């Protein structure tokens, strides 16, 4: 977690449930990453406990998430002089989208009790709209390189953490040990506890 900083100054690293300064000593597993874009006026909307229009119908963040995001300004990656209309978003939904649930929406949303599945020219509204990425909107509408990272402290063997090297095993002295991210103080001795290796 040290090659992460060569991608311009960031509008992120405000981390809940994890310390951004200490990212190598702790060990965990099962890290999931997703990639999308944000407008810019709602960078802080990607947070647990926040519910509005953004991150309520596209990607809802759960209250118990213990993770954070990385994000910075995109001025040359995808913003062009002719504009960019690559990304879309969901306008209307029947209810709040459950977190960690990928969804697709192309069908026509209705705002009444009349039958409407594909009929236009009425109050039925298309639930998608095209992002206009232009340099003329400095803060209001700008592409961003936002990526969400998810972490969990499940009862699983540790897989991904810092590249810090190990040391030689020592016995008969009570010290602090870091065994697969488990912090504790005690003495290490040969154990007579023998069980099935599972």
């Amino acid at each position: 977690y040290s090659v992460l900083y060569n991608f311009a100054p960031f509008f992120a690293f405000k981390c809940y449930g994890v310390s951004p300064t200490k990212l190598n000593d702790l060990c965990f597993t099962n890290v999931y990453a997703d990639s999308f874009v944000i407008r810019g006026n709602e960078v802080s909307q990607i947070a647990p406990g926040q519910t509005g229009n953004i991150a309520d119908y596209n990607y809802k963040l759960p209250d118990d998430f213990t993770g954070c995001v990385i994000a910075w300004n995109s001025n040359k990656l995808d913003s062009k002089v002719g504009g960019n209309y690559n990304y879309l978003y969901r306008l209307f939904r029947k209810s709040n989208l459950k977190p960690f649930e990928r969804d697709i929406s192309t069908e026509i949303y209705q705002a009444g009790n009349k039958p409407c599945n594909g009929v236009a020219g009425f109050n039925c509204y298309f639930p998608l709209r095209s992002y206009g990425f232009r340099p003329t909107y400095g803060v209001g509408h700008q592409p961003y390189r936002v990526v969400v990272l998810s972490f969990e402290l499940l009862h699983a063997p540790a897989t991904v953490c810092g590249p810090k090297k190990s040391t030689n095993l020592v016995k008969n002295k009570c010290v602090n040990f870091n065994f697969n991210g488990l912090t504790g103080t005690g003495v290490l001795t040969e154990s007579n506890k023998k069980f099935l290796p599972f």
């Epitope: 062009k80 002089v81 002719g82 504009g83 960019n84 209309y85 690559n86 879309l88 192309t106 026509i108 594909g118 009929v119 236009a120 020219g121 298309f126 998608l128 095209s130």
Partner: antibody, heavy 126, light 109 residues
Framework: VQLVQSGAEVKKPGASVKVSCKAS????????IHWVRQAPGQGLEWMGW????????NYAQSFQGRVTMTRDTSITTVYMELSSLRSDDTAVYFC????????????????????WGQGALVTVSS | PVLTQPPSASGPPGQSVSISCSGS????????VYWYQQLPGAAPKLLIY???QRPSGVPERFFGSKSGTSASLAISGLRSEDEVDYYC???????????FGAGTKVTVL
């Protein structure tokens, strides 16, 4: 501004002809480009689209493998070939451009041909 | 495929002529239809797109809107703007591409 397309004269059916589209004024690295042809006595028929920045290529349902769409930023032009031309599908080719930059099916709803580059009317005769 | 529109549309100036663009379910209603007017030997021109906002230099007298499974357009005043055919432009998933009209041959009378 407006675009140009270099065509050929009347040739025999059953051969290969190479066309080109060269941009003018603007930088040809930001604009999605389309293709379309108009049969004599009939409306326009959609062909497909590419982009001169990446390997995104789509065709119509009738000419999926008949033509090859090539791009090259260094010469700043786009070539297509027509292998074994018939006597019905030969038509004027519009080097149409669309604003923005995408290659998604759902993106095509908010894409319109803002300006139309004039092309060459090509025909075939043995 | 090909759209069904009456090609032999004509009439004396001073009245209103209405043309309707037939289409399938995925072509009109789930997408935004456009209208292209083309000239022989030159580039076409844009008049109606998304049926609610107009380009620069396009007169307000052109009227094209959708109200169901088939969009419709109406013309009024045949002096120069109705001297050449129009095209019904839409998008659908039947061929994963844009569709064009067959040509509404309207001249000046």
């Amino acid at each position: 501004v407006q675009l140009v397309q270099s065509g050929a004269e009347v040739k025999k059916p059953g051969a290969s002809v190479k066309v080109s589209c060269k941009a003018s004024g603007y930088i040809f690295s930001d604009y999605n480009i389309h293709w379309v042809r108009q049969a004599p006595g009939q409306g326009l028929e959609w062909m497909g689209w590419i982009s001169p920045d990446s390997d995104d290529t789509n065709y119509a349902q009738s000419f999926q493998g008949r033509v090859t769409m090539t791009r090259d930023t260094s010469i700043t032009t786009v070539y297509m070939e027509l292998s074994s031309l018939r006597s019905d599908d030969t038509a004027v080719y519009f080097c149409a451009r669309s604003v923005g930059y995408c290659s998604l099916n759902s993106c095509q709803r908010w894409m319109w041909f803002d300006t139309w580059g004039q092309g060459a009317l090509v025909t075939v005769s043995s | 495929p090909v759209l069904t529109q009456p090609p032999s549309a004509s009439g004396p100036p001073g009245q209103s002529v209405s043309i309707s663009c037939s289409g399938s379910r995925s072509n009109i209603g789930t997408n935004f239809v456009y209208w292209y007017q083309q000239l022989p030997g030159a580039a076409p021109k844009l008049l109606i797109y998304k049926n609610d906002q107009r380009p620069s230099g396009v007169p307000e007298r052109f009227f094209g809107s959708k109200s169901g499974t088939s969009a419709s357009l109406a013309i009024s005043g045949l002096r120069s703007e109705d001297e050449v055919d129009y095209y019904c432009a839409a998008w659908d998933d039947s061929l994963s591409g844009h569709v064009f009209g067959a040509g509404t041959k309207v001249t000046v009378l």
